[PDB]
Amino acid sequence: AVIGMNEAASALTPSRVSSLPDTQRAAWQEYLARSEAQLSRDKASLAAELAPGQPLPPPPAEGKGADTMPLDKPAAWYTSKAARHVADVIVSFQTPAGGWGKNQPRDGALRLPGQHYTGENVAKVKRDRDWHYVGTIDNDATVTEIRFLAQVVSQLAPEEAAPYRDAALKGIEYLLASQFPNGGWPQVWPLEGGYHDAITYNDDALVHVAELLSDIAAGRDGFGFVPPAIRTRALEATNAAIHCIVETQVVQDGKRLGWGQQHDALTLRPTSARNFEPAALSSTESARILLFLMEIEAPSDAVKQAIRGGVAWLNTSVIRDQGAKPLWSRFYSLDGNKPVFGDRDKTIHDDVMGISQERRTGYAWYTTSPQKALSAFTKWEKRS
Ligand SMILES: [Cl-]
Ligand SMILES: [Hg+2]
């Protein structure tokens, strides 16, 4: 009932990179130097908005965000005052780097000068401010804001949509700058450290980023205003991201397998996240990566193997009869692909009942989600 223990993930530090595979990663050094540069720029910028002695404004709004940035409303809705205001809110909360934080309703107030971009604790009473997820692609962050911005733009007059376009381009420049030298993407950028520095597939983070750049490269969904020079970069970026997905797929000696929520930017092997999230193949995140690859027009054999492989392991590992409909363990043992679970105490188990109910509840360790990649593979194998 207790497989092993969960070790912490490894931050992408200069020492991990100092192991230069012969002037091969002078790229990663530059990458970190830019990350650090931007980070300071971010903090100094917010600080510059406050006046000496001026009390901190209250923390910004928090809660479900994506639902305040609907991307499927009718065209007309994007010309309304309601949509224009969501855009203004969006434009006001973009970080100097060009990104956005998560869990922030954008239908309320505009960010006040000196007010945090994403969120912080109330400064109870009786410049060192909180800095977590200040530019993330988790929970659909950044990607959603850029898509919304583009919808509004596409339904307004060119002469009346400069701010939204400009914030959109900053957002696209943000996603381009944060991409790893090997095409992957970190959950937070500028780099915050820890498992946040891992190539993040978790919550569709990387897939969403790649689909966004793909669309930009194509000039669709309202990105027709994007300069060709930048659309070319988004294309190259999307190709790099696809490659990454390919060079990261877990190969069980000969066979191909799933992917797992996060991978080390240098090791490429599945790494860990939180105390209760050990390095391990992920059913749900694999199904998403698969659905994404099956979307590719004229896949290379490399991409063809990846799809066929992942889809297979998704079938070698299923569930008889949380029962009636096909099942999958959120996580599967890299060694010996079998259901795996964990707890807030770094201990890896092989039974949900061997976990604190606090973790046994809320968090979902089993799921039917993967099925989506199966029905998809069917029609996909044909034209390939
Ligand atoms: Cl087409
Ligand atoms: Hg990669």
From TrEMBL:
Example of a GO MF term: lyase activity
Source species, domain of life: Bacteria
UniProt keyword Coiled coil, yes or no: no
A Pfam family that the UniProt record links to this protein: Pec_lyase
InterPro entries membership: Pectate_lyase
Keywords: Lyase, Signal
NCBIfam families from the UniProt entry: pec_lyase
Name of the protein in its database record: Pectate lyase
UniProt lineage: Bacteria, Pseudomonadati, Pseudomonadota, Alphaproteobacteria, Rhodospirillales
